[PDB]
Amino acid sequence: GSSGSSGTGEKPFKCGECGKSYNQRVHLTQHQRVHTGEKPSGPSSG
């Protein structure tokens, strides 16, 4: 079988990291935050 979800309508802005679109650009940039913040190192135990 093969299935997949997709947004309803169309937006000028879209997130190419997870797949979340937003009518406005202010609703996208504030969302991409979840894709930017962590660190590849983290709390190093010396």
Ligand SMILES: [Zn+2]
């Ligand atoms: Zn996203």
